[PDB]
């Protein structure tokens, strides 16, 4: 059939974050709570428009929202988050009760500077109502003409013209 | 996967073959049976693994259930015909014929 | 026959697990899922022959997903040119394809 | 590093059987007021090795009526799933970790059987018929009501896996919560294990040797390490489902030294029930099996699904 | 590494063979417990473990019963393995030879691609949610539990009835 | 105290999880850049250089649908190496 | 791969074992040797003959039972369920169901061990 | 009733496997009918988070639903975090 | 035996074919069956005689195998679709793998030879329940899938059902293996018009029912096993001789019967589909089968064969026969032909 369409090495080259899994969950947090609009955007359109060749300028900007909450990270505090984020790395699972003090000197870290405030236990798992100005895509999944139904009869039940018609029987 | 699946549905070929080739032996046929049941079971959950079809994933556990229940009632059968006779023979069970 | 307690009744025993697009475990799919939605949809209300007949495209696209016969015969058509390329010598393979990669995450 | 790391499992395990051949001749020798070996080591430390010389280079001596190809798989087969079972232990970490940890142990418990079933079945002799018999019906028993226990605790559990064991016995053990199961635990691993009360298997009053009876050296010293292999086993798979030892993060090696202790403990228990008690009858254990445990953990099986529920205390999945 | 499943479907394959030639049900139930096994194995292979594990289990108790029962009546004074017959083992070997023409005849003729030599171990397992909890095979049987209750009870009056059914037909 | 460290650690599995969502939409985006770059790469490499036979289309799919179908395994790794292919088949599966 | 390696050298080390134990000492074979034991006279039957085991019904029902078990092992995961109450009903009838059997079969005497 | 306290006596001294294995049976039916933990557990299992919250598209005609993660609407946990 | 374990038996037999005809998923149809089977085996096996052992051990081996090969055509069929139906696109070779097992379910020729062999040393109320009750749930199955059948297969398999059951009850002296005999036969009928009308085999289903249940029910009160057992009936009950020759008339086909309904209309349907080779075909082996019911009826009705001197005691006792069951379904089965238009549906 058609020729399937997808973008190029230059509009698929980003800044990669080029940090680790559990520097991550250390401040994971933290960076779902400061650009939670952006990365709520790319879902968004990313659930809506099921193509991912379409989304690209929000998951670019998921990428530069990320370095830039890392880059204020790394030029405010940084030692305590470097501890941190090595003590979940000891661990097999990155389990987060394990290292509650380091969690607790960059959380003070954070709330000092910057005046960030930790979610609480039931407050990033739950539905955003983001804004945002691109249209709606009317027709997802590229449906086709969905063929009209059968024609059907209307009209009053008359009873059976000369009864059952069936061979010799006159009722 | 396609010559997996292959190899599962000659494998219940085979094991069909044996079940309707008779070898003087009801326990023999039995084993037969649940080879099929097995060859069976592999292909189900072969194909709900593919698929991702864990809403059908019960579907394995209730052919093996129904499969041990009827390996059970074979084995009771093969019990009352042993008693019969004492040797499980197929061929000497043959008196209903007439 | 085939009577229908279960409409009458407007319970659903076994309703909601007749195909892989319904209702699956926590949130998942079933890797088919639109073309098996599209299908269904397209075959909805017109069943039988009619859907037999003018929902081939929707059906063809699902039956390819599910078995991916085309996509085996299209990816061993390329195999089988590049290994013909590799042996007459004419093609050496780029350093991501064969070999190390630059990684990206 | 990782045939570094098998060696470093297999090798300990192996010399632990042996010395627990020795602690076991010690054990029960003091219990009935005479003295272990203390002549072929200094204390008897070199009894198992020239025990284990002797038996490996005695003939294995073939037999005429024998199917020699199972004759000679059984006690391959047995010695093999005995260290595959020992495989996925952790202490505190596995060497392989398996989410289905505990359904892997099942299996490989119930294919030992078969090892037991296929020695007795072609060693063709009568008592070896007699002993494969008693095999199929004390693993029928014992099976039923493993498959319950564990159920049960690992409904108290989280999933399948091991080390989610010692995250939940990280404040407590499951001995508190769950007493009953151990108790029922403890004879099922017993039964398992085939060993006294209710051995039956290697019966050496009621038969002569069970399944072993034509089993000469070589091959039946395979099936003695085997069997102490699956006792030191079950003892240890005791102490990490319900004596749970102490684990903290920065340092393991006070959890192996727990689960050494324990595990000591329970298979010196294992040697003094072998001491202390008389044998049942192959059908007494199956009457009391299905007609006390199997009532009492179908109700506590019971008991532990409703208790998560009504205590909102549901574990997590991992 | 690619074509493990292969392999382990042609171990399948020559099992269910052996059980077919039907020797003594000692070596039957020998020939079920390692296709129960490598079945085990293929349905590891492909995905989630539950499944495998619940299958071998359920036929190591299966074979168990299965082998007190050919020990108790279904036994004869010489219970043939393979060799009593030269024409078993002949079978044996000519269905061997059969399934390699087969496959190679279905490798030449590669038109409907069912099994390719080149485009084996390339399509396993199919597509994979990569970031994602709770995936794996055992939370749809779990779901019989919630979501397939007509599922559970026709099991477990399917197992009800069989414990009637049995001593009703050995109550003798 | 089974009740107790149960609630516990279901406090805990939600924080997990909820570290893992927050996570979640950096992840997507680099997964899709990344399909997207393998199928680029692999669309080129087909292009170009593989096929000269006359009648083939290079970026031709097997749907009529026209819309995005999510690549297989098979589809992004065949034109790798088997390493890479075994690792992409059986690399949770063997990791134990 | 790693299991793979481990049950491989678990295996080869049983082969070993045993190879050893054939092939290292020295071997004498005779008639009366390699005959079967049978406590020291000649064994009157074949040890093939029909054994006729006493406890078949509770075999069967050991299937049965081992089958109910296949079916209550998916409740650590099925605990995690969001509705829990027709969880927890579903559990209670199939224990209940299990057990009510196992009260027929031992009103029945099912499990006597008829000689 | 004195023939069943007698009853249930005997069979406490004769065979107190039965008897233990019925009264747990029993318990284990009754105690989720009458325990103030059961609606917990439910709760609990919806409120963990195994999927990703998909976010809603903001018409504006919605109020109940937040606009942030740090907001006062939406299920807060704190009964779960004081339970 | 005991009331619980019959409760349980019976519930589960009726359960059964209830669970596989309102059930829309494959696999429930299948674990119909197989409740059907397995509940079904403990009452034919009953009287622990080495007749009911061997017929219930056939039985079991032929249905299990049948039962496998379903779930072999529900498994492909799975894999090839994905859901648990087949809906209009399935392959050929699934949908005859499924006829054919169901054929070999329902016992018709050329998978035929156990169901004589079954109901020969099985009591005549299991007989009766075997061959009216097991036959609806594979007849659901088939009619389930009106379309997408291999009208050539289904014709062959009925010709040759129709010809091999008027061949057997031409030879049979046995009354239960004449009764499997005419079942064979009247299930090649229904498998003729299956792919036509489902409403034809419906019709054809529950006109054969109600013409074999009283014709099991009238052997039933006697204990009358053979041809000369059903012949000592004049002194035994004289009353019933009547009915059942009316009833023995019907079976074969003979107007003003009802029983010449079914093979009238499906013969007229098959003439409105251009089939008229199978259909004379059909008939004349009808004819052949009223020939041996006829032999029947001359052994039993219009001559008076010799008696023994205890029917003297038999006639000194007195009997009990069913209320509701027996004269209704018998006059129902015979004299209700000028209702055909409201019996065709
Ligand atoms: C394709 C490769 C896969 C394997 C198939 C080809 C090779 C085997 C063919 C079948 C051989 C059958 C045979 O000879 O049986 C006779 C033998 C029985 O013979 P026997 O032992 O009674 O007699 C031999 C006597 N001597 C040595 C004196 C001549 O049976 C077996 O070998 C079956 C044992 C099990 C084999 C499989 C074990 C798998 C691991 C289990 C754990
Ligand atoms: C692993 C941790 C340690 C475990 C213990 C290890 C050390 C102790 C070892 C002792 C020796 C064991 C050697 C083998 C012994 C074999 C014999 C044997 O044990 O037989 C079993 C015996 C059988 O006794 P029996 O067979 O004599 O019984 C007679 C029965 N008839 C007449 C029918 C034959 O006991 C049991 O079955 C009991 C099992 C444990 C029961 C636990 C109940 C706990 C309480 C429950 C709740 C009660 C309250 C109810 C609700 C109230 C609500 C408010
Ligand atoms: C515990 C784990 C390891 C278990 C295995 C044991 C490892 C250590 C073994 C050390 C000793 C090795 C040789 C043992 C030989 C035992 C049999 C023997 O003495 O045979 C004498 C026989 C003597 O043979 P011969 O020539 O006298 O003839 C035998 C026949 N007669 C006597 C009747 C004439 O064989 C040998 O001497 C073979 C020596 C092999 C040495 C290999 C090293
Ligand atoms: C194809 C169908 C025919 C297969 C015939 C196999 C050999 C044979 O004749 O088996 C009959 C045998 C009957 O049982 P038995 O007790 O052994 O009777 C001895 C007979 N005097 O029955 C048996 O021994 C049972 C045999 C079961 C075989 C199942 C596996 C079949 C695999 C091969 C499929 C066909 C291959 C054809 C190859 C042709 C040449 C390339
Ligand atoms: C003397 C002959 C003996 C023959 C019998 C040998 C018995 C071996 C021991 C008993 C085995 C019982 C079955 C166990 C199956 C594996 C259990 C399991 O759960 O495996 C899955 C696991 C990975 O799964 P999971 O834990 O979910 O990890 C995902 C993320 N971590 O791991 C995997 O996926 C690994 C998959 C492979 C593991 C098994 C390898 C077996 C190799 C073949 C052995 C036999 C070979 C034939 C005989 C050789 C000659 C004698
Ligand atoms: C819902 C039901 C299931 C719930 C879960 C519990 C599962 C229990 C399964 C087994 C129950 C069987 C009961 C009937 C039975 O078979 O009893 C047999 C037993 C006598 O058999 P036996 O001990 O072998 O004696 C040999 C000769 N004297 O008989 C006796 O010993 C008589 C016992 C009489 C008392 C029974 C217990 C009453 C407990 C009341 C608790 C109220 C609070």
Not at chain 1, 92 to 118: S, T
Not at chain 5, 143 to 158: E, K, N, R
Not at chain 7, 41 to 63: G, H, N
Request: include cysteine; glycine fraction near 6%.
């Amino acid at each position: 059939p058609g020729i399937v369409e997808l973008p190029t090495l230059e509009e698929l080259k980003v800044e990669e974050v080029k940090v680790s899994s559990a520097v991550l969950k250390a401040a994971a947090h933290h960076y779902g709570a400061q650009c939670d609009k952006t990365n709520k955007e790319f879902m968004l359109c990313r659930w809506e428009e099921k193509d991912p060749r379409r989304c690209l300028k929000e998951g670019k900007l998921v990428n530069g929202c990320a370095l830039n909450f890392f880059r204020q990270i790394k030029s405010h505090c940084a030692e305590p988050f470097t501890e941190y984020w090595t003590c979940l790395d000891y661990s097999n699972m990155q389990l987060f009760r394990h290292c509650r003090q380091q969690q607790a000197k960059f959380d003070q870290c954070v709330l000092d500077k910057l005046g960030w405030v930790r979610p609480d236990l039931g407050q990033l798992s739950k539905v955003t109502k983001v804004k945002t100005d691109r249209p709606l895509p009317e027709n997802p999944y590229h449906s086709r003409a969905r063929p009209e139904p059968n024609p059907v009869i209307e009209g009053d039940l008359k009873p059976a013209k000369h009864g059952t018609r069936f061979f010799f029987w006159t009722v | 996967m396609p010559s997996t699946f292959f190899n599962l549905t000659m494998a219940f070929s085979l094991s069909l073959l044996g079940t309707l080739m008779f070898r003087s032996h009801l326990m023999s046929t039995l084993l037969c049976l649940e080879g099929m049941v097995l060859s069976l079971f592999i292909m189900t959950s072969v194909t709900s693994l593919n698929s991702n079809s864990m809403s059908s994933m019960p579907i394995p556990i209730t052919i093996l259930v129904f499969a041990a229940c009827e390996a059970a009632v074979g084995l009771a059968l093969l019990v009352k015909v042993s008693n019969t006779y004492g040797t499980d023979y197929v061929q000497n069970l043959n008196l209903l014929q007439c | 026959p085939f009577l229908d307690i279960q409409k009458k009744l407007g319970i659903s025993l076994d309703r909601h697990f007749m195909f892989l697009s319904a209702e699956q475990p926590y949130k998942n799919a079933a890797r088919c899922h639109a073309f098996e939605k599209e299908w269904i949809e397209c075959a909805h209300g017109i069943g039988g022959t009619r859907a037999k007949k003018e929902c081939k495209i929707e059906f063809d696209d699902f039956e390819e997903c599910l078995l991916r016969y085309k996509t085996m015969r299209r990816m061993h058509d390329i195999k089988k040119q590049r290994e013909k390329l590799m042996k007459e010598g004419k093609y050496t393979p780029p350093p991501h394809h064969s070999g190390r990669e630059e990684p990206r995450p | 590093m990782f045939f570094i790391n098998i060696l470093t499992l297999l090798v300990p395990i192996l010399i632990a059987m042996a010395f627990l051949t020795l602690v076991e001749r010690k054990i029960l020798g003091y219990m009935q007021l005479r003295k272990g070996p203390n002549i072929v080591g200094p204390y008897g430390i070199l009894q198992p090795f020239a025990d284990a010389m002797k038996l490996f280079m005695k003939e294995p001596m073939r037999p005429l009526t024998t199917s020699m190809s199972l004759f000679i798989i059984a006690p391959t087969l047995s010695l093999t799933l005995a260290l595959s079972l020992w495989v996925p232990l952790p202490m505190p970490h596995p060497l392989i970790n398996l989410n289905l940890g505990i359904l892997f142990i099942l299996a490989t418990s119930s294919l030992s059987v078969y090892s037991i079933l296929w020695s007795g079945w072609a060693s063709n002799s009568k008592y070896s018929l007699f002993g494969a018999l008693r095999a199929v019906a004390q693993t029928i028993s014992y099976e039923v009501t493993m498959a319950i226990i564990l159920l049960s605790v690992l409904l108290m559990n989280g999933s399948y896996s091991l080390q989610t064991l010692i995250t939940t016995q990280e404040h407590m053990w499951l001995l508190l919560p769950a007493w009953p199961m151990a108790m029922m635990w403890f004879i099922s691993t017993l039964a398992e294990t085939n060993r006294a009360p209710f051995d039956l298997t290697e019966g050496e009053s009621e038969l002569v040797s069970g399944f072993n009876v034509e089993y000469a050296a070589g091959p039946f010293a395979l099936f003695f390490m085997a069997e102490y292999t699956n006792i030191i086993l079950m003892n240890a798979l005791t102490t990490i489902i319900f004596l749970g030892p102490l684990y903290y993060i920065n340092l393991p090696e006070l959890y192996s030294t727990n689960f050494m202790m324990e595990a000591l403990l329970l298979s010196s228990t294992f040697l003094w029930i072998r001491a202390s008690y008389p044998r049942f009858r192959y059908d007494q254990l199956m009457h009391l099996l299905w007609k006390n445990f199997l009532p009492l953990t179908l109700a506590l099986c019971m008991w532990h699904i409703s208790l998560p529920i009504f205590t909102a205390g549901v574990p997590p999945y991992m | 590494m690619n074509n493990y499943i292969f392999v382990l479907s042609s171990l399948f394959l020559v099992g269910c063979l052996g059980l077919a030639l039907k020797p003594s049900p000692i070596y039957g139930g020998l020939g079920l417990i390692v296709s129960g096994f490598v079945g085990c194995l293929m349905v590891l292979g492909f995905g989630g473990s539950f499944l495998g594990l619940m299958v071998f289990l359920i036929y190591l108790g299966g074979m168990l019963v299965v082998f007190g029962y050919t020990t108790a009546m279904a036994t004869e004074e010489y219970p043939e393995t393979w060799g009593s017959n030269w024409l078993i083992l002949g079978f044996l070997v000519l269905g061997v030879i059969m399934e390699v023409f087969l496959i190679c005849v279905l490798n030449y003729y590669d038109e409907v691609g069912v099994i390719n030599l080149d485009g084996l171990g390339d399509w396993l397992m199919y597509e994979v949610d990569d970031v994602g909890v709770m995936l794996e095979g055992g939370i749809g049987v779990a779901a019989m539990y919630s979501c397939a209750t007509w599922m559970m009870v026709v099991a477990g009056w399917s197992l009800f009835a069989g414990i009637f059914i049995i001593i009703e037909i050995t109550r003798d | 105290r089974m009740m107790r460290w149960n609630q516990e650690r279901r406090r805990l599995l939600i924080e997990d999880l909820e570290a893992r969502i927050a996570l979640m939409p950096l992840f997507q985006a680099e997964k899709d850049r990344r399909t997207l770059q393998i199928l680029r790469e692999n669309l080129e490499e087909e292009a170009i250089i593989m096929k000269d036979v006359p009648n083939w289309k290079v970026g031709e799919s097997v749907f009529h649908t026209t819309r995005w179908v999510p690549p297989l395994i098979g589809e992004m790794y065949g034109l790798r190496t088997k390493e890479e292919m075994s690792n992409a088949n059986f690399g949770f599966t063997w990791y134990t | 791969m790693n299991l793979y390696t481990v049950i491989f050298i678990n295996i080869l080390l049983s082969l070993t074992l045993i190879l050893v134990a054939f092939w290292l000492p020295q071997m004498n074979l005779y008639s009366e040797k390699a005959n079967p034991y049978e406590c020291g006279f000649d064994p009157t039957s074949s040890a093939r003959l029909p054994f006729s085991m006493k406890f078949f019904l509770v075999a069967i029902t050991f299937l049965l039972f081992d089958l109910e078990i296949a079916l209550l092992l998916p409740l650590p995961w099925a605990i995690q369920t969001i509705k829990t109450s027709t969880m927890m009903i579903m559990a209670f009838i199939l224990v209940t169901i299990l057990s009510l059997g196992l009260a027929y079969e031992w009103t029945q005497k099912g499990l006597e061990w008829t000689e | 009733a004195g023939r069943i306290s007698a009853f249930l006596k005997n069979a406490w001294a004769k065979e107190p496997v039965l008897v233990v294995s019925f009264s747990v049976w029993g318990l284990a039916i009754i105690m989720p009918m009458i325990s103030p933990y059961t609606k917990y557990a439910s709760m609990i299992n919806k409120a963990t988070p195994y999927n990703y919250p998909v976010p809603v598209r903001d018409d504006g005609n919605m109020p109940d639903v937040p606009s942030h993660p740090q907001d006062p609407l939406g299920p807060s946990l704190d009964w779960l975090k004081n339970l | 035996m005991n009331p619980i374990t019959l409760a349980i038996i019976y519930f589960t037999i009726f359960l059964g074919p209830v669970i596989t005809m309102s059930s829309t998923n494959l696999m429930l149809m299948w674990v119909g069956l197989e409740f059907s089977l397995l509940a079904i085996i403990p009452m034919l096996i009953n009287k622990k005689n080495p007749r009911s052992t061997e017929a219930a051990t056939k039985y079991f081996v032929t249905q299990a195998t049948a039962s496998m090969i379903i779930l072999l055509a529900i498994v492909l069929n799975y894999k090839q679709l994905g859901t648990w139906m087949f809906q209009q696109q399935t392959n050929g070779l699934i949908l005859n793998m499924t006829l054919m097992a169901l054929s070999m379910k329902l016992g018709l020729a050329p998978f035929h030879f156990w169901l004589p062999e079954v109901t020969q040393g099985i009591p005549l109320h299991m007989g009766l329940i075997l061959l009216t009750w097991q036959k609806i749930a594979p007849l659901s199955i088939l009619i389930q899938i009106y379309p997408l059948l291999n009208s050539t297969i289904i014709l062959m398999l009925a010709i040759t059902s129709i010809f091999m059951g008027a061949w057997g009850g031409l030879n049979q002296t046995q009354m239960r293996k004449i009764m499997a005999y005419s079942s064979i036969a009247h299930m090649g009928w229904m498998l003729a018009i299956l792919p036509y009308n489902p409403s034809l085999t419906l019709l054809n289903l529950m006109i054969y029912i109600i013409l074999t249940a009283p014709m099991f029910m009238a052997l039933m009160l006697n204990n009358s096993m053979t041809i000369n057992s059903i012949s000592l009936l004049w002194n035994k009950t004289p009353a019933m001789l009547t009915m059942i020759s009316l009833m023995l008339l019907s079976l074969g086909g003979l107007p003003p019967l009802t029983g010449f309904l079914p093979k009238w209309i499906i013969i007229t349907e098959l003439m409105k589909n251009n089939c008229l080779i199978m259909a004379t075909l059909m008939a004349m082996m009808a004819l052949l089968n009223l020939f041996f019911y006829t032999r029947l009826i001359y052994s039993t009705s219009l001559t008076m064969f010799p008696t023994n001197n205890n029917s003297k005691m038999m006639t000194h006792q007195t009997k009990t026969k069913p209320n509701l069951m027996f004269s209704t379904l018998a006059i129902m089965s015979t004299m209700t032909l000028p209702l055909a238009p409201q019996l065709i549906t």
